[PDB]
């Protein structure tokens, strides 16, 4: 552990500075160090962890998509042979992306999920597990693709089951989980009808619970509800 000699509180402080400086690789390294201290994470600290890795992997995914498109065009009829370089570089980026996903999944497995007993923490981590398996699935083409997809599905499903039992329909973690599981259905599992049904049912059940909320909670929940609506508009 490169961060083994730094205090937990200093790692957290520096993660916050790295976020302000848009240094997301540093932010992720600091938060990995904080997790490896072995203590549970607070709400704020869980969000630092997720933001850091979301931004790192988000950049890798965007780059992978650019390179994959170039590679696809190189393999069309009439395209002039340019050698192994496009495939090699796409593979380089892909391997880096898989490494980041494996790092996150490793933190969740050792030992964030097993120590998370409150619904808010457990659902948060299980959503992350689904998300990072989904990112692995986006680039998977081999013998294990089905198993990767099923790992994502299983994590999301456990998170959904807990969220429906333990959280109100407007809870932002519940809403974001459903948003992302809906995308999993549409983009990964070839299940657009399931995707649409989940987004609709989630939106409508949240709408019906908004009356219970403060102004500030209302703002939070309605922001995520609009993302559900945006996806529904894209898909219908």
């Amino acid at each position: 552990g490169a961060m083994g000699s730094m205090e937990r509180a200093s790692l957290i402080q520096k993660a916050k500075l790295a976020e302000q400086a848009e240094r997301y690789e540093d932010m992720a390294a600091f938060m990995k160090g904080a997790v490896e201290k072995g203590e549970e994470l607070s709400c704020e600290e869980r969000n630092l962890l997720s933001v850091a890795y979301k931004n790192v992997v988000g950049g890798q995914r965007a780059a992978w998509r650019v390179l994959s498109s170039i590679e696809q065009k190189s393999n069309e009829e009439g395209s002039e042979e340019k050698g192994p370089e496009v495939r090699e570089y796409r593979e380089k980026v892909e391997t880096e992306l898989q490494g980041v996903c494996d790092t996150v999944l490793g933190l969740l497995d050792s030992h964030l999920i097993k120590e998370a007993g409150d619904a808010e923490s457990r659902v948060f981590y299980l959503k992350m597990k689904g998300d990072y398996y989904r990112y692995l699935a986006e680039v998977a083409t081999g013998d294990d693709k089905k198993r990767i997809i099923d790992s994502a599905r299983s994590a999301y499903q456990e998170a959904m089951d807990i969220s429906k039992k333990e959280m109100p329909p407007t809870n932002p973690i519940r809403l974001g989980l459903a948003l992302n599981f809906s995308v999993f259905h549409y983009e990964i599992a070839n299940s657009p009808e399931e995707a649409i049904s989940l987004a609709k049912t989630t939106f409508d059940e949240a709408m019906a619970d908004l009356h219970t909320l403060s102004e500030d909670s209302y703002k939070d929940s309605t922001l995520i509800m609009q993302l559900l609506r945006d996806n529904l508009t894209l898909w219908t």
């Binding site: 998300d131 948003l179 993302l227 898909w235």
Partner: peptide
């Protein structure tokens, strides 16, 4: 691409 959080 669709929205995720």
């Amino acid at each position: 691409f669709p929205a995720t959080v």
